[model samples]
Target: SHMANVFFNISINDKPEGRIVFKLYDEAVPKTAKNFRELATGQHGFGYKDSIFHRVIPQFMLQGGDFTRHNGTGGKSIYGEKFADENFQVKHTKPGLLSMANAGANTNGSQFFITTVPTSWLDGKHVVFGEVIEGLDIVRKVEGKGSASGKTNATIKITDCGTV
Candidate 1:
């Protein structure tokens, strides 16, 4: 998706925190991107509250949006809109890249991922929504403490999100 005069702010607690702007790409991953917009607003879809980025990997990324914890394990996926077509052309070529978190074909839901590294291997397989426009240092900070158990000390929190 291209910029629609909209933007998302990454905040902490209730303060205007964070150091980056993640513009949603509605054209690339329509389903994933659409919900991302709604979820960031803290409205009917303000479901991001208290959703901690509990999963992280130093060289990889930090995974959150576990509505399963608070929203319940039975939380519904985005009406099968989470996953994209397998033949997509977008490639993970740099850091700050946003992509869907999926288990298998068409299994993706609201869960997504952001990497601190250039994940070229993920091209086509994962539905990329957009790239982080700033504050990669924070991404590096998170990656620095991940459970390199590749699987130990992964830390993340739902700081904030919204359209500019």
Candidate 2:
């Protein structure tokens, strides 16, 4: 199951920050993971390149991956429509937990959030697909209070991403 995991190396300000490796539960969260994989692998026309961390809540979570509008407004899946959610035992109980960003039930698309700390309140509300095993410090840096909306020059460049 670990072999199915994917890695995403991120860069900030045109410089290498670090990598955020996560394992997508393909079976547990098929549609959600499939959407993320397609987007990350550039099979969906656009990836996380030049995407801004539009919503960053200090000590809460850093939300981004909106490659379309880059303002947390316009991002769609490869299927060009919102997909249904999946059932998983994972939870947003710690930092580096990767969860899909959505408007409501079955609205998951091309946006996601990474937690900066434990957020039990979001346990079942969000789809916890993966967790950051490395470069959490970089995630924290990304979650810093640099901008009120984190929509500043806080660009995310996915240097590399794939199954490995």
Candidate 3:
């Protein structure tokens, strides 16, 4: 059934296009994906709202999830998931794929990034959470056009992270 599948959706408080979808690696990267879903959907998670894209490289990708930043400036880290479990199958093979941004192994908390371009080079390092299901153009518009400090100076807010 759907449990064998990994599909998630995202929504924001602002704009007509409020919903987007994604495919997680629940089977491939079970713990990471499961943790992401829990934090993003259930009451225990940060919900990513008002968060900022901390890092932005034009035509490259945007990175966020540091709740310490003004955009994501709220929340605490939970028990971290492991890397490369026996069931892991997905590779960082596509854009819009959400990956965990960690300072070191097992140090992952509230930090992640979305790929703007294929970043297979980062495989086995960053814990990829899920892949954006739709609305790449919208992600493109917001992700790669921020200031040198990303959307911080502009005060862009994420406004939500509901399982997308």
Candidate number achieving the greatest lDDT relative to the actual structure = 2
Relative to the unseen true structure, what is the C-alpha lDDT of residue 79 in candidate 2, on a scale of 0 to 100? Answer: 73
Which prediction has the highest TM-score against the true structure?
2
Compared with the true structure, all predictions reach lDDT values of: 0.61, 0.75, 0.58
Tens-digit lDDT track of model 1 for 1-164 = 22342243444334444655676666655666666556655455545645656667777886656655632232235454354443355677877877877777766666777877778887767777777777677667666766775433333456555556
Instruction: Summarize candidate 2's per-residue lDDT along 54-108 as a digit string, tens digits.
Output: 7777777888788888788978887776777776478777778889888988888
Taking all chains together, each candidate's TM-score versus the true structure is: 0.76, 0.84, 0.71
* RMSD versus native structure for model 3: 4.3
Better of 1 and 3 by TM-score: 1
| lDDT (Cα, 0-100) at 141 in candidate 1 | 66
